[PDB]
């Protein structure tokens, strides 16, 4: 999270850290007791490693009462996702068991109505990703309020040049942005999850490259099928 500030500890109970060999790899969102939503490209260069989901965390290094590291029972990427495309960049992780819920661990409701978040709407994005251009990752959870950018502005040649589909959404990126390590993380508009970060190899905090988020509402039937 670039140009943001530290999140109040445990104020986002749905926040998860998708880990590879005990190191933060991607953001994640607890959507059901045993299921975490993240991005498919997160698992791309893992193959050998121990994939785990850390819940009720604020600090990645420091012990906290609520912090519990969970093993992964099942990894369900979207069936149509693959390595060469930003399309369908969603991943459903099944925890070793149902999550121990409490004040710091609780699932988040996701947008079911397939209609765009109005341009200008202020949304909240959190994650343990890079905070500057030097690649510095934070110890504690960071967040930033971002205005939703309309698809037409986002599709300009200066920006994403037509790459923004109806299943993707945009947010402003001028010196306040999602970055490397924030992928799989949540984009929340009015307490409801609207998008899952899909950063990739996009430069961050540059007004010329707006932030890209997968619209959860577009994948309503698929999430229900995996969770049922």
């Amino acid at each position: 999270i670039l140009g943001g500030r530290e999140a109040e500890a445990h104020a986002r109970p749905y926040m998860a850290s998708v880990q590879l060999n005990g190191a933060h790899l991607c953001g994640g969102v607890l959507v059901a007791e045993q299921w975490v939503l993240s991005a498919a490209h997160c698992l791309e260069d893992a193959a050998d490693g121990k994939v785990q989901v850390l819940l009720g965390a604020h600090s990645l290094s420091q012990p906290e009462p609520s912090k519990r590291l969970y093993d992964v029972l099942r990894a369900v990427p979207h069936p149509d996702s693959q390595p060469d495309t930003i399309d369908h960049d969603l991943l459903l992780l099944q925890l070793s068991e149902k999550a121990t819920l409490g004040p710091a661990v609780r699932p988040l409701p996701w947008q079911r109505v397939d209609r765009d978040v109005a341009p200008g709407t202020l949304c909240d994005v959190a994650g343990w990703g890079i905070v500057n251009h030097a690649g510095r990752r934070p110890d504690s959870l960071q967040h930033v309020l971002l205005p939703v950018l309309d698809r037409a502005t986002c599709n300009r040649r200066t920006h994403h040049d037509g790459a923004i589909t109806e299943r993707l959404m945009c947010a402003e990126s001028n010196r306040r942005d999602s970055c490397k390590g924030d992928s799989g993380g949540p984009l929340v508009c009015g307490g409801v999850l609207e998008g899952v970060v899909t950063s990739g190899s996009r430069v961050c905090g540059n007004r010329k490259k707006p932030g890209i988020y997968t619209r959860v509402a577009s994948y309503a039937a698929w999430i229900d099928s995996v969770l049922a």
Partner: antibody, heavy 115, light 108 residues
Framework: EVQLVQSGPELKKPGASVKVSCKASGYTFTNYGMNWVRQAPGQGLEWMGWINTYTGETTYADDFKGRFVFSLDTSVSTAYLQISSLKAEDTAVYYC????????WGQGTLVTVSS | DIQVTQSPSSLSASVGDRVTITCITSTDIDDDMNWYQQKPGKVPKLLISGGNTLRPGVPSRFSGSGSGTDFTLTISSLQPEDVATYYCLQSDSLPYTFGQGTKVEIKR
């Protein structure tokens, strides 16, 4: 496939106004904005401005502020250019260019301003 | 509004020659330079987009270079069909801005 089809040539008297249409097909009209370009006879291309097809917001190049208005009709996926208080110097080919993706242009519209 | 200065106004070269056209912006624009080709009675054709990206169905003899302020369009081996007016367009921010154009003729 993507198509941008503009209305036919028009002759207008000085002081009158003109409305040029740019009918878009083969893509989601609101996913891409529309640019307007003018080419006076034997002159260079002039970027007039843009219209955001999702929000209706407009940005005009300095030379084009005032007498030039971009508008939309989302129901028919059409972008419009309205030029008021026409003068001899407005005699030009007016193009619409879809902003972003595989680059697409309308065929142009010759507007002649004469008595 | 960002200003662009295209050069030269016109040139003449033989088949096989190398054509060099330049555009200088009033500010640092990064990679956001475009090049268009316009044949006599035809609509403009985008040849090169930002980052000096060649467009589909554009011959490889066309190439772009430069960053920030100083941009160049190169036609490595001038062909008869290349006779046209060439325009650069800066797309850093709105409003976008065209160069004055360069008319390219063939010396035969």
């Amino acid at each position: 496939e993507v198509q941008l089809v503009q209305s036919g040539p028009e002759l207008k008297k000085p002081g009158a106004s003109v409305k040029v249409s740019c009918k878009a097909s083969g893509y989601t009209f609101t996913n891409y904005g529309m640019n307007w370009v003018r080419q006076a006879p034997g002159q260079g291309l002039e970027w007039m401005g843009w219209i955001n097809t999702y929000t209706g917001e407009t940005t005009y190049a300095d030379d084009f502020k005032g007498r030039f208005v971009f508008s939309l009709d989302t129901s028919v996926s059409t972008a419009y250019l309205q030029i008021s208080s026409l003068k001899a110097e407005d005699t030009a080919v007016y193009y619409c260019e879809r902003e972003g993706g595989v680059n697409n242009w309308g065929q142009g519209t010759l507007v002649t301003v004469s008595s | 509004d960002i200003q662009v200065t295209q050069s030269p106004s016109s040139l003449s070269a033989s088949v096989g020659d190398r054509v060099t056209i330049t555009c200088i912006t009033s500010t640092d624009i990064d990679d956001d330079m475009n090049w268009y080709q316009q044949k006599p009675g035809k609509v403009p054709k985008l040849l090169i987009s930002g980052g000096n990206t060649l467009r589909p169905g554009v011959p490889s003899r066309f190439s772009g270079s430069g960053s920030g302020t100083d941009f160049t369009l190169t036609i490595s081996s001038l062909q008869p069909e290349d006779v046209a007016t060439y325009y650069c367009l800066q797309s850093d921010s709105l409003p976008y801005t065209f160069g004055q154009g360069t008319k390219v003729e063939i010396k035969r």
